[PDB]
Amino acid sequence: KDPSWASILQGLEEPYHAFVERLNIALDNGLPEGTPKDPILRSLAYSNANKECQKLLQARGHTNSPLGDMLRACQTWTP
Known about the structure:
Blueprint: H1 16-30, H2 37-47, H3 51-59, H4 67-74
């Protein structure tokens, strides 16, 4: 059963921060005790982002950057 949080995908018109927030909440609830959240969150923030935000993140070299940088990068994107 793939972790419920691994299936969280950014919607087509969902702002990136809203998506990251849902992801963050899911990880808080679903990660076993002692599992590092931050590296998982960063990885998923990129890999589960919609195509537009993924492009922005790639273009800026933020495919594994701190979450703050990823948030700033996708802010320019408004559905």
